[PDB]
Amino acid sequence: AAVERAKATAARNIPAFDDLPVPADTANLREGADLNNALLALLPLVGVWRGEGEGRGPDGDYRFGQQIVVSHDGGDYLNWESRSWRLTATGDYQEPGLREAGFWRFVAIELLLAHSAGYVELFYGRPRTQSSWELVTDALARSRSGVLVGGAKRLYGIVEGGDLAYVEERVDADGGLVPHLSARLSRFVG
Amino acid sequence: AAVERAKATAARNIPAFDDLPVPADTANLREGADLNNALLALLPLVGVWRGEGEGRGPDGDYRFGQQIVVSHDGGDYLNWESRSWRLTATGDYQEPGLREAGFWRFVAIELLLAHSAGYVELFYGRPRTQSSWELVTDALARSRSGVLVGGAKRLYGIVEGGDLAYVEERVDADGGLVPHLSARLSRFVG
């Protein structure tokens, strides 16, 4: 079953224009531009990931679904996009959730993000193993209508079976990092 | 000829996954989720734009090609991606150029960006007409390996024939805004 799943995802790639003079974005390291040497520590992230997660809100815990797309065009960065959506307690689609887009660079890890909710964020961090990474917020800036937020720590890692798991903690008013989000996503592409 | 071009681009949309519970990203206001009412001032931007531009560098002026993708998923923001590439003086593909990704919001205009070169940027501004917009940098933050840059002013507008044109100025050391980039892009989608 595990060998077949890998075969299925290895045959896929993201939808992309094939008609530009620059390389098409690829989320499958079997296709497209060579991965830049700077990025080898991040190699397991490349792909499309889909699954569900759990968050801690004002009204208790809640469920969400999510897709993360991690691609590259042969440059010294990874393209990153995450889209989430709220699920009811019973697992039904409720409404759209948060979206973010940006880039990973490795040169120490940097994650540069814009958020649809109306702020930008810079994360800095380090690999913990060949397939796990830790990042912490170093800068935040919002637009006038943007949400008010605090710094975070994100821990990402490939877990047994190949899924991408993560935990995001946020700083509380009292300065302590507390649980905020967690998710485990199955590979869909790559 | 102009009616036929509009017909050609109106029949197209961006490559996108069609299998998620959230709406597929659309760069064609004839297809997909309703455009959020907050975004009507920005409506002419939605689409895929392709063309060439000119920049001012250390060694004189240079040419580049560019694609900008402006889409939405029914939320109160536009998705934005720009990819550029250097051209030789004679118009030949030279090497990849800069990439940025983020979101426009309208609620005053906000443009929130991550840049592949290693920084995040917040722009704030205002519509000048139904089809032109002005934005100025309010925040910049870089990663350790990121490029050193200064604030900019961007002016975007739809010009006669329907092309998207823009000018980007940067602040010089002496505090003056000077020409930096300009481009005129034809609609490819929408």
Coordinates of C-alpha atoms in Angstrom, one line a residue:
Chain A
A1 CA 0.0 0.0 0.0
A2 CA 2.8 2.4 0.9
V3 CA 4.8 1.7 -2.3
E4 CA 1.6 2.3 -4.4
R5 CA 0.9 5.6 -2.7
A6 CA 4.4 6.8 -3.5
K7 CA 4.0 5.6 -7.1
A8 CA 0.7 7.6 -7.3
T9 CA 2.1 10.9 -6.0
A10 CA 5.3 10.5 -8.0
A11 CA 3.3 10.5 -11.2
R12 CA 1.7 13.9 -10.5
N13 CA 2.8 17.5 -10.6
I14 CA 1.1 20.9 -10.0
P15 CA -0.9 22.6 -12.8
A16 CA 1.4 25.2 -14.3
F17 CA 1.9 27.2 -17.5
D18 CA 4.3 25.4 -19.9
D19 CA 4.9 28.3 -22.2
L20 CA 7.3 30.7 -20.5
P21 CA 11.1 31.1 -21.1
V22 CA 11.7 30.5 -17.3
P23 CA 11.3 26.9 -15.9
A24 CA 7.8 25.8 -15.0
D25 CA 7.2 25.6 -11.3
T26 CA 7.6 22.0 -10.1
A27 CA 6.5 20.2 -7.0
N28 CA 8.0 16.9 -8.1
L29 CA 11.8 16.5 -8.0
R30 CA 11.6 14.0 -10.8
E31 CA 10.4 16.7 -13.3
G32 CA 11.5 20.3 -14.2
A33 CA 14.5 22.4 -13.2
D34 CA 17.4 20.9 -11.2
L35 CA 16.9 21.7 -7.5
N36 CA 19.4 24.4 -6.5
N37 CA 22.2 22.9 -4.3
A38 CA 21.5 25.5 -1.6
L39 CA 18.1 23.8 -0.9
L40 CA 19.1 20.1 -0.2
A41 CA 18.3 20.4 3.5
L42 CA 14.7 21.3 2.5
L43 CA 14.3 18.7 -0.2
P44 CA 11.6 16.6 1.6
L45 CA 9.3 19.6 1.7
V46 CA 8.8 19.9 -2.1
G47 CA 5.4 18.5 -3.1
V48 CA 1.7 19.1 -2.5
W49 CA 0.4 18.2 1.0
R50 CA -3.3 17.8 2.0
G51 CA -4.9 17.0 5.2
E52 CA -6.6 18.3 8.4
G53 CA -5.5 20.1 11.5
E54 CA -6.6 21.3 14.9
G55 CA -6.6 24.8 16.3
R56 CA -7.1 26.5 19.6
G57 CA -9.6 29.3 19.5
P58 CA -11.5 31.6 21.9
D59 CA -14.3 29.0 22.0
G60 CA -12.2 25.9 22.4
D61 CA -10.6 23.6 19.8
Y62 CA -11.7 23.6 16.1
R63 CA -10.9 21.6 13.0
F64 CA -9.6 22.9 9.6
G65 CA -8.5 21.4 6.3
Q66 CA -5.4 22.6 4.5
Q67 CA -3.3 22.3 1.3
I68 CA 0.3 23.4 1.2
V69 CA 2.1 23.7 -2.1
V70 CA 5.9 23.7 -2.1
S71 CA 7.5 24.1 -5.5
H72 CA 10.6 25.5 -7.1
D73 CA 11.7 27.0 -10.5
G74 CA 15.5 26.2 -10.2
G75 CA 16.3 29.3 -8.2
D76 CA 17.7 29.4 -4.7
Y77 CA 14.4 29.4 -2.9
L78 CA 11.2 27.3 -2.6
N79 CA 7.8 28.7 -3.5
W80 CA 5.4 28.3 -0.6
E81 CA 1.6 28.5 -0.5
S82 CA -0.8 27.4 2.2
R83 CA -4.6 27.6 2.0
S84 CA -6.8 26.5 4.9
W85 CA -10.5 26.2 5.5
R86 CA -12.6 25.9 8.6
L87 CA -14.4 22.6 9.2
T88 CA -17.4 22.2 11.5
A89 CA -16.9 20.0 14.6
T90 CA -18.3 17.2 12.6
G91 CA -15.9 17.5 9.7
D92 CA -18.0 19.3 7.2
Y93 CA -16.7 22.2 5.1
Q94 CA -17.7 25.5 6.9
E95 CA -16.0 28.4 5.3
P96 CA -12.6 29.6 3.9
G97 CA -9.7 30.0 6.3
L98 CA -6.4 31.7 6.1
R99 CA -4.0 31.9 3.2
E100 CA -0.3 32.7 3.1
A101 CA 2.3 32.8 0.3
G102 CA 6.0 33.3 0.1
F103 CA 9.5 31.7 0.0
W104 CA 11.9 29.5 1.9
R105 CA 15.6 30.2 1.6
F106 CA 18.5 28.3 3.1
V107 CA 21.7 30.3 3.5
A108 CA 20.1 28.9 8.7
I109 CA 16.5 28.8 7.2
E110 CA 14.4 31.9 6.3
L111 CA 10.7 31.8 5.6
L112 CA 9.3 35.0 4.1
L113 CA 5.5 35.3 4.1
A114 CA 2.6 37.5 3.1
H115 CA -0.7 36.7 4.7
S116 CA -4.2 37.2 3.1
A117 CA -5.4 38.5 6.6
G118 CA -3.3 41.6 6.1
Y119 CA 0.3 41.3 7.4
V120 CA 3.8 40.2 6.4
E121 CA 6.0 38.0 8.5
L122 CA 9.7 37.0 8.5
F123 CA 10.7 33.7 10.2
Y124 CA 14.2 32.6 10.9
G125 CA 15.4 29.2 12.1
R126 CA 17.3 26.0 11.6
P127 CA 17.1 22.4 10.5
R128 CA 16.7 20.0 13.4
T129 CA 17.3 16.8 11.3
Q130 CA 17.4 16.0 7.6
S131 CA 13.6 16.1 7.5
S132 CA 12.6 18.5 10.4
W133 CA 12.9 22.3 10.7
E134 CA 12.2 24.9 13.4
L135 CA 11.4 28.6 12.6
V136 CA 10.5 31.6 14.9
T137 CA 9.0 35.0 14.0
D138 CA 11.5 37.9 13.8
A139 CA 9.3 40.5 12.2
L140 CA 5.6 41.3 11.6
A141 CA 4.0 44.3 9.9
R142 CA 0.4 44.9 9.2
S143 CA -1.7 46.9 7.0
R144 CA -4.3 49.2 8.6
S145 CA -7.1 46.7 8.2
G146 CA -4.9 43.7 9.0
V147 CA -5.3 41.4 11.9
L148 CA -3.4 41.9 15.2
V149 CA -1.1 39.0 15.9
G150 CA 1.9 37.9 17.9
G151 CA 5.1 36.0 17.3
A152 CA 5.1 32.3 16.6
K153 CA 7.3 29.2 16.6
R154 CA 6.7 26.7 13.8
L155 CA 8.1 23.1 13.9
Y156 CA 7.7 21.1 10.6
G157 CA 8.8 17.5 10.1
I158 CA 8.3 14.4 8.0
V159 CA 6.8 11.7 10.2
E160 CA 6.7 7.9 9.9
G161 CA 4.9 7.0 6.6
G162 CA 6.0 10.2 4.9
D163 CA 3.3 12.7 6.0
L164 CA 4.2 16.3 6.8
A165 CA 3.4 17.3 10.3
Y166 CA 3.7 20.6 12.1
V167 CA 3.0 22.5 15.3
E168 CA 2.6 26.2 15.5
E169 CA 2.9 27.9 18.9
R170 CA 2.2 31.6 19.6
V171 CA 3.4 33.9 22.3
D172 CA 0.7 34.7 24.9
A173 CA 0.4 38.1 26.6
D174 CA 2.4 36.7 29.6
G175 CA 5.3 35.9 27.3
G176 CA 4.8 32.1 27.3
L177 CA 4.7 30.1 24.0
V178 CA 1.4 28.1 23.9
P179 CA -0.1 25.6 21.5
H180 CA -2.0 27.2 18.6
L181 CA -2.2 25.0 15.6
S182 CA -1.2 21.5 14.6
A183 CA -1.7 19.4 11.5
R184 CA -0.7 16.2 9.7
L185 CA -0.9 16.3 6.0
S186 CA -0.6 13.5 3.4
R187 CA 1.6 13.8 0.3
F188 CA -0.6 14.3 -2.8
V189 CA 2.2 15.3 -5.3
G190 CA 5.8 14.5 -5.5
Chain B
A1 CA -8.3 42.7 -34.0
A2 CA -9.0 44.2 -30.6
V3 CA -12.4 42.4 -30.2
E4 CA -10.7 39.1 -31.2
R5 CA -7.9 39.5 -28.6
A6 CA -10.5 40.1 -25.9
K7 CA -12.3 37.0 -27.1
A8 CA -9.1 34.9 -26.9
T9 CA -8.1 36.0 -23.4
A10 CA -11.7 35.7 -22.2
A11 CA -11.8 32.0 -23.0
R12 CA -8.7 31.2 -20.9
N13 CA -8.0 30.8 -17.2
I14 CA -5.0 29.8 -15.0
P15 CA -4.1 26.2 -14.4
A16 CA -5.5 25.3 -11.0
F17 CA -6.5 22.3 -9.0
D18 CA -10.3 21.6 -9.4
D19 CA -10.6 19.2 -6.5
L20 CA -10.6 21.2 -3.2
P21 CA -13.6 22.2 -1.1
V22 CA -12.6 25.9 -1.4
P23 CA -13.1 27.7 -4.7
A24 CA -10.4 27.3 -7.4
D25 CA -8.3 30.3 -7.9
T26 CA -9.6 32.3 -10.9
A27 CA -7.9 35.0 -13.1
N28 CA -11.1 35.4 -15.2
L29 CA -14.1 37.2 -13.8
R30 CA -16.4 35.1 -16.0
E31 CA -15.5 31.9 -14.1
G32 CA -15.3 30.7 -10.5
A33 CA -16.2 32.4 -7.2
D34 CA -18.0 35.8 -7.1
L35 CA -15.6 38.7 -6.8
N36 CA -15.8 40.0 -3.2
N37 CA -17.5 43.4 -3.2
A38 CA -14.6 45.0 -1.4
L39 CA -12.5 44.5 -4.5
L40 CA -14.5 46.3 -7.2
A41 CA -11.9 49.2 -7.4
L42 CA -9.3 46.6 -8.3
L43 CA -11.4 44.6 -10.7
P44 CA -9.4 45.4 -13.9
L45 CA -6.2 43.9 -12.4
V46 CA -7.6 40.3 -12.3
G47 CA -6.0 38.3 -15.1
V48 CA -2.6 37.1 -16.4
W49 CA -0.4 39.7 -17.9
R50 CA 2.8 39.1 -20.0
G51 CA 5.3 41.5 -21.5
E52 CA 8.6 43.2 -21.3
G53 CA 10.0 46.1 -19.2
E54 CA 13.0 48.3 -18.7
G55 CA 15.1 48.8 -15.7
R56 CA 17.9 51.1 -14.6
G57 CA 20.9 49.3 -13.3
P58 CA 24.5 50.1 -12.2
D59 CA 25.6 49.5 -15.8
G60 CA 22.9 51.5 -17.6
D61 CA 19.4 50.4 -18.7
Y62 CA 18.5 46.7 -19.2
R63 CA 15.5 44.7 -20.5
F64 CA 13.4 42.1 -18.7
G65 CA 10.4 39.9 -19.4
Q66 CA 7.6 39.4 -16.9
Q67 CA 4.4 37.6 -16.1
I68 CA 2.0 38.8 -13.4
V69 CA -0.8 36.6 -12.2
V70 CA -3.7 38.3 -10.4
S71 CA -6.4 35.8 -9.2
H72 CA -9.0 35.4 -6.4
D73 CA -10.8 32.7 -4.6
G74 CA -13.9 34.7 -3.5
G75 CA -12.2 36.1 -0.4
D76 CA -11.5 39.8 0.4
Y77 CA -8.1 39.9 -1.3
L78 CA -6.5 39.3 -4.7
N79 CA -3.7 36.7 -5.0
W80 CA -0.6 38.3 -6.7
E81 CA 2.4 36.7 -8.2
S82 CA 5.1 38.3 -10.4
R83 CA 7.9 36.5 -12.1
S84 CA 10.5 38.3 -14.1
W85 CA 13.6 37.3 -16.2
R86 CA 16.5 39.2 -17.5
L87 CA 16.8 39.7 -21.3
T88 CA 20.0 40.5 -23.1
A89 CA 20.2 43.9 -24.8
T90 CA 19.1 42.1 -28.0
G91 CA 16.0 40.6 -26.5
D92 CA 17.2 37.1 -25.8
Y93 CA 16.4 35.2 -22.6
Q94 CA 19.4 35.7 -20.3
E95 CA 18.6 34.3 -16.8
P96 CA 15.9 34.3 -14.2
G97 CA 15.0 37.6 -12.5
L98 CA 13.0 38.4 -9.4
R99 CA 9.9 36.8 -8.1
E100 CA 7.3 38.2 -5.5
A101 CA 4.1 36.8 -4.1
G102 CA 1.4 38.1 -1.9
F103 CA -2.0 39.8 -1.7
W104 CA -3.9 43.0 -2.5
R105 CA -6.6 44.2 -0.1
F106 CA -8.9 47.2 -0.4
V107 CA -10.3 48.5 2.9
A108 CA -7.1 52.6 0.8
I109 CA -5.2 49.9 -1.0
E110 CA -2.7 47.5 0.8
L111 CA -0.2 45.3 -1.1
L112 CA 1.6 42.7 1.1
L113 CA 4.6 41.0 -0.5
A114 CA 7.2 38.3 0.1
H115 CA 10.2 38.6 -2.3
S116 CA 12.3 35.6 -3.4
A117 CA 15.4 37.8 -3.0
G118 CA 14.9 37.6 0.8
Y119 CA 12.7 40.3 2.2
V120 CA 9.1 41.2 2.9
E121 CA 7.4 44.5 2.1
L122 CA 4.2 46.3 2.9
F123 CA 2.8 48.9 0.5
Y124 CA 0.0 51.3 1.2
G125 CA -1.8 53.5 -1.2
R126 CA -4.9 54.6 -3.1
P127 CA -6.8 54.4 -6.3
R128 CA -6.1 57.3 -8.7
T129 CA -8.9 56.3 -11.2
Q130 CA -11.2 53.3 -11.8
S131 CA -8.3 51.6 -13.5
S132 CA -5.1 53.2 -11.9
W133 CA -3.5 52.8 -8.5
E134 CA -0.6 54.2 -6.5
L135 CA 1.3 52.4 -3.7
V136 CA 4.3 53.4 -1.5
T137 CA 6.4 51.2 0.8
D138 CA 5.7 51.5 4.5
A139 CA 7.7 48.5 5.8
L140 CA 10.7 46.3 4.7
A141 CA 12.4 43.5 6.6
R142 CA 15.0 41.2 5.4
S143 CA 16.4 37.9 6.2
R144 CA 20.2 37.7 6.9
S145 CA 21.0 36.7 3.4
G146 CA 18.5 39.0 1.8
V147 CA 19.2 41.9 -0.5
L148 CA 19.6 45.5 0.9
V149 CA 16.8 47.7 -0.6
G150 CA 15.1 51.0 -0.2
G151 CA 11.5 52.2 -0.3
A152 CA 9.6 52.4 -3.5
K153 CA 6.6 54.0 -5.2
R154 CA 4.6 51.9 -7.6
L155 CA 2.1 53.3 -10.1
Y156 CA -0.1 50.7 -12.0
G157 CA -2.7 51.5 -14.6
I158 CA -4.7 50.1 -17.5
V159 CA -3.6 52.0 -20.7
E160 CA -5.3 52.5 -24.0
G161 CA -5.9 49.1 -25.6
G162 CA -6.2 47.4 -22.2
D163 CA -2.5 46.6 -21.4
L164 CA -1.3 46.9 -17.8
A165 CA 1.5 49.4 -17.4
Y166 CA 3.5 50.4 -14.4
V167 CA 6.3 52.5 -13.1
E168 CA 8.4 51.7 -10.0
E169 CA 10.5 54.5 -8.5
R170 CA 13.0 54.0 -5.6
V171 CA 14.3 56.4 -3.1
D172 CA 18.0 57.3 -3.7
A173 CA 20.5 57.9 -0.9
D174 CA 19.8 61.6 -1.2
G175 CA 16.1 61.1 -0.5
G176 CA 14.8 61.7 -4.0
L177 CA 12.5 59.2 -5.8
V178 CA 14.1 58.2 -9.1
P179 CA 13.1 55.9 -12.0
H180 CA 13.8 52.3 -11.4
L181 CA 11.5 50.0 -13.4
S182 CA 8.8 50.4 -16.0
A183 CA 6.8 47.8 -18.1
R184 CA 3.8 47.4 -20.3
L185 CA 2.2 44.0 -20.3
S186 CA -0.5 42.6 -22.6
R187 CA -3.4 40.6 -21.1
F188 CA -3.1 36.9 -21.7
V189 CA -6.0 35.7 -19.5
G190 CA -9.2 37.2 -18.4

